[PDB]
Amino acid sequence: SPADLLTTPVLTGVGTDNRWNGEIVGLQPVPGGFSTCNRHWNLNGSTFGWSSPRFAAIDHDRGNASYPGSSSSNVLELWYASAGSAADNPISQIAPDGFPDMSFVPFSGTTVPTAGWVGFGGIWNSSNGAPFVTTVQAYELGFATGAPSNPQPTTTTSGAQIVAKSIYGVATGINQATAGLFVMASGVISTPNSSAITYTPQPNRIVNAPGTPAAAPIGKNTPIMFASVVRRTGDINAEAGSTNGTQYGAGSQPLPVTVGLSLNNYSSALMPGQFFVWQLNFASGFMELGLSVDGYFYAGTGASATLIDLSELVDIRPVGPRPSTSTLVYNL
Amino acid sequence: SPADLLTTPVLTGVGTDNRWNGEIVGLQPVPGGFSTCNRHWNLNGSTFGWSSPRFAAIDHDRGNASYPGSSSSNVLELWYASAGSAADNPISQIAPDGFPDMSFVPFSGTTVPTAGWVGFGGIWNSSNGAPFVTTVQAYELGFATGAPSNPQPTTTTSGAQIVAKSIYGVATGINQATAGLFVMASGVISTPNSSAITYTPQPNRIVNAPGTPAAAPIGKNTPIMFASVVRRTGDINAEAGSTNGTQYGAGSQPLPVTVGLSLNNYSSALMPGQFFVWQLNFASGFMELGLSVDGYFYAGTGASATLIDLSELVDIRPVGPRPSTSTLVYNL
Ligand SMILES: [Cl-]
């Protein structure tokens, strides 16, 4: 039984999302539908992604590193490689374990990109493993085509490039035909100013491998993402509330669910066309969440795009397998 | 019952240690004894530390930022504040949530400190939350006294300072009497060259709050730390089996145990003078692990300081409460 995949602490402040590793504080309905594969598991014990259910480091030993111009001081460092070149990754060769499933947002000069996945790290020497210490910075990572001259976002891994570019000037730029990338897997969201932006990533920014099943509305049941509070570059101190607006990152699954799914095969527990349902009991009222065999979560919220605050969630109780066509209860 | 705190995946490659968040691959006996409080819970639902059972970010909004002893090619950014000044931390005011429990290792020039806790981040503007983008780098963090003129290691929180110093040159130094620190909580170990060093931290480097209970041998039973493979600055690409040597970080508890202990009170389950015992079944042979009420783990390995490899661990079975004076079986 999948019942213990989702227990009360998973959604009441201990559980984190599988994209940003932020504490989950809300449920974000996606009436338009979405797809996610990276660090996403199904109930048949499998992933279409390239990442294990953890947040460690991103490591790739063979990419092209460069900076523009003839002055090496305070420059934007650019790193890129082909998708499918991650030979050292046992899960998938598509990308290094932990590389974010987000499309690259191009920028140059003094522009800081909006809604990029950003991580801290730098370039290192492919021949001996030594870091290029003058290249440490915050880097936006994403999938693109057209690097290095004109990188543009792409949402498919097939034929893509994996790109890292420092959003601020590094101490001294480095030009290497072959160089390593090392970036911490726990990301923040890039903003050019103190203002928060919409939940990130939006569905059209998510990068997916071929064959990734889509999450679509089933009747009045709508797929959701799990909203967490995520740091943003424009106002790094900002956390939940009051301070200049709240920034949400979103993930397809709670990481504890992803971990459990990765350790187990739940094929006997649930049939296709079924949800495993939990009841979420709030201080006043309650709602149901449903989990499909493809590993997507649903709510009975229909066309609504309004975020559901989990601040008053009290406990979670298993309901069991139900028809995916049965509208999930929403009494909030 | 605490039995489900330690299940097979916790020590067979999924569970991470509570200091470095690295995947646990070994058990490190500490015949000399040790103490740990940070991100360490007991069976009475309590911690003597200053950190929650998670790895996010380190944030303090009021420290002194400077860059003395710097050249134009090499500017080491220094941040420090008093221990006990972390007013925003609901757990403890000793230090910001996630600040490492390690004594500061002094360094200067281009010298890289040995066995330092290093994290990525930078300084930010206390008045508006904006990052000082020219200060992003890898920083060693630790407890010290004598900042800013002569920082020296300390292992007691009382009267201490919390210090961050970039191990590499930042793009541009920043002098502010009041400034913020922001560093990702997931750390790496500083090494001056490609070689691995001893497991980190050694017991004499660990910082502890007043009242922290010590782990000492009880008869033939010896306290252990949980060893994980941790990244090092000298060879950032190196992982398990590196021809430059394998680097271990160590933590007092597996993080899943710490999380479980933080969510429930197990005081009725175990009394002082008792271990909760699990049997670890390997491919050839087996051993017992014991957990005390203070949350420390023990093995019946006596004076041995030899690391126990978990690569051939097959499964874990709960045994139950046993007297701490009873020698834990070691049959490997
Ligand atoms: Cl804090």
Radius of gyration of the CA atoms of chain A, in A: 20
What's the B70 CA to ligand 1 centre distance in angstroms? 30
Question: Nearest CA to A297 among A203, A227, A218, A223?
Answer: A223
The answer to whether A233 and A167 have CB atoms below 8 angstroms apart is yes
What's the B65 CA to ligand 1 centre distance in angstroms? 18
* Residues from chain B contacting residue A22 (CB–CB below 8 Å): 56
Cross-strand bridge partners of residue A208? A156
CA angle, A148 then A151 then A153, to 5°: 150
Cross-strand bridge partners of residue B316? B280
What the block records as the tokens of A319 is: 């309901």
Q: Is B319 exposed, middle or buried (0-12, 13-18, 19+ CB in 10 A)?
A: middle
Question: Nearest CA to B182 among B141, B122, B98?
Answer: B122
Q: B133 vs chain A: nearest CA distance in angstroms?
A: 6
Instruction: Tell me which method was used to determine the 3D structure.
Output: X-ray
Residue of chain A nearest B168, judged by CA positions: A133
Which distant-in-sequence residues (6+ apart) come within 8 Å of B150 by Cβ? none
Q: What span, in angstroms and rounded, lies between the C-alpha atoms of B167 and B145?
A: 19
Check CB contact under 8 Å for A14 and B259: yes
Place of tokens 């051939």: B312
Q: What span, in angstroms and rounded, lies between the C-alpha atoms of B239 and B244?
A: 10
Q: What span, in angstroms and rounded, lies between the C-alpha atoms of A272 and A265?
A: 14
Radius of gyration of the CA atoms of chain B, in A: 20
H or E element at residue B10: helix B8-11
Assign residue B20 a region: left if phi > 0, alpha if psi is -120 to 50, beta otherwise? alpha
Stated in angstroms to one decimal place, the resolution of this structure is 2.0
Which distant-in-sequence residues (6+ apart) come within 8 Å of A242 by Cβ? none
Q: What span, in angstroms and rounded, lies between the C-alpha atoms of B258 and B296?
A: 11
Torsional sign, CA A196, A200, A204, A206: positive
Which distant-in-sequence residues (6+ apart) come within 8 Å of B249 by Cβ? B17, B19, B20, B22, B189, B199, B200, B227, B228, B229, B230
Peptide bond into B131 cis (omega under 30): no
**Distance (Å) of CA A216 to CA A219, A253, A294, B59, B190:** 9, 15, 11, 39, 47
The one-letter amino acid at B242: S
Task: Give the three-class secondary structure for B294.
Answer: coil
What the block records as the tokens of A167 is: 């959003």
Cross-strand bridge partners of residue A251? A226
Q: B124 vs chain A: nearest CA distance in angstroms?
A: 8
Q: A304 vs chain B: nearest CA distance in angstroms?
A: 31
Cα diameter, chain A: 65
Torsional sign, CA A193, B170, B181, A15: positive
Check CB contact under 8 Å for B184 and A184: yes
Render B113-137 in DSSP notation, one character per residue.
PSSEEEEEEEEE-TTT--B-GGG-E
What the block records as the tokens of A185 is: 């897997």
Which distant-in-sequence residues (6+ apart) come within 8 Å of B17 by Cβ? B24, B225, B226, B227, B228, B249, B250, B251, B253, B254, B255
What the block records as the tokens of A7 is: 């227990």
CA angle, B43 then B46 then B51, to 5°: 125
Cβ of B194: how many Cβ atoms within 10 Å? 18
Q: Which residues of A59-91 are buried (b: 16+ CB within 10 A; e: fewer)?
A: bbbbbbbbbeeeeeeebbbbbbbebebbeebee
Q: What span, in angstroms and rounded, lies between the C-alpha atoms of A247 and A232?
A: 7
Length of chain A: 332
Q: Is B158 exposed, middle or buried (0-12, 13-18, 19+ CB in 10 A)?
A: exposed
Question: Nearest CA to A290 among A29, A39, A17, A44?
Answer: A29
Find the CB nearest B59 among A131, A134, A237: A237
What the block records as the tokens of A186 is: 């726990």
Q: What span, in angstroms and rounded, lies between the C-alpha atoms of A107 and A170?
A: 15
Place of tokens 């006596």: B302
Question: Nearest CA to A328 among A16, A228, A296, A268?
Answer: A296
Count of CB pairs separated by less than 8 Å, A with B? 115
* Residues from chain A contacting residue B14 (CB–CB below 8 Å): 54, 259, 263
Which distant-in-sequence residues (6+ apart) come within 8 Å of A11 by Cβ? A24, A226, A254, A280, A310, A313, A316
Question: Nearest CA to A193 among B111, B101, B61, B129?
Answer: B129
* Residues from chain B contacting residue A23 (CB–CB below 8 Å): 54, 56
DSSP class of residue B237? T
What the block records as the tokens of B140 is: 């060693």
